[PDB]
Amino acid sequence: ECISVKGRIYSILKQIGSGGSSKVFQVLNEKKQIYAIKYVNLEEADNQTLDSYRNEIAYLNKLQQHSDKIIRLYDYEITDQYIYMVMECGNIDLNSWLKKKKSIDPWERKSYWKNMLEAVHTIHQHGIVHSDLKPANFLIVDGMLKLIDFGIANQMQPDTVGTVNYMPPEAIKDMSISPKSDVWSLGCILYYMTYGKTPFQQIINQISKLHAIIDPNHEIEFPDIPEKDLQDVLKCCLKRDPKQRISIPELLAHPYVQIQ
Ligand SMILES: COc1cc(C(=O)N2CCOCC2)ccc1Nc1nc(NC2CCCCC2)c2c(C#N)c[nH]c2n1
């Protein structure tokens, strides 16, 4: 199996992921260099689905000028039937990597944290609130974390369901949402990265897992730990009132990010 894209040919190693009309492949260029290739079959997709993807490509194209914690987009080809995006290939996504791990280097957790803050900070500066952040949105490449999805396009699942653990409260209470909402979801990823579980992984019953998230008089537990700065970061990310929740520019000024 192969794929030509704006001139070049690529051997399809394997298929990383699926979703709707999309597929992601690990591939090699003619020079045994490795890459990822996203394929969208446009054959039918409502002009909402269509415009979703055009918006992703544009932002991905603009944003990578501003931060190397966004995935690279090396080249692309668009027509009425298909899309091909040639991107830098990750070693793996945070979600899969997390679930294999338990030995979680604290120096590495800290560094992945700044990684995610820079990425999300970058999209916030160009007016995007992802508002569905989760570990599967981050790729480990070069011992670094890089954001992939921007929340605009249909995200994908791995290939051999997804969660609600990372939902911000004001997301729920909104069905009768700011940059603050990504702060929540980043908190859940850090919480998970420190305590080895997300806040409400507890409640396995979804229709009420949601309750806990919405509920003020329901306390998330914060076991004391050596890094109490890290404890404090989780404490200010996971505040249910977005107005009282810490901002990204504040997070980048917090001792946990800035000392040692
Ligand atoms: C070596 O390659 C990868 C392997 C794995 C992996 O270990 N497994 C096993 C478990 O099941 C999933 C695959 C994960 C991500 C890899 N690298 C990668 N993945 C990308 N997308 C996937 C991310 C996560 C969900 C499915 C799509 C994109 C992308 C886009 N879009 C641009 N560059 C990308 N690089």
From Swiss-Prot:
Changing residue 149 to A: Loss of kinase activity. ATP binds at residues 16-24, 38. The active site is at residue 132. Residues 10-257 form the Protein kinase domain. Present in rapidly proliferating cell lines. Belongs to the protein kinase superfamily. Ser/Thr protein kinase family. Involved in mitotic spindle assembly checkpoint signaling, a process that delays anaphase until chromosomes are bioriented on the spindle, and in the repair of incorrect mitotic kinetochore-spindle microtubule attachments. Phosphorylates MAD1L1 to promote the mitotic spindle assembly checkpoint. Phosphorylates CDCA8/Borealin leading to enhanced AURKB activity at the kinetochore. Phosphorylates SKA3 at 'Ser-34' leading to dissociation of the SKA complex from microtubules and destabilization of microtubule-kinetochore attachments. Phosphorylates KNL1, KNTC1 and autophosphorylates. Interacts with TPR; the interactions occurs in a microtubule-independent manner. Interacts with MAD1L1 and MAD2L1. This is Dual specificity protein kinase TTK. It comes from Homo sapiens. The lineage of its organism: Eukaryota, Metazoa, Chordata, Craniata, Vertebrata. The chain holds residues 516 to 794 of 857 of the full protein.
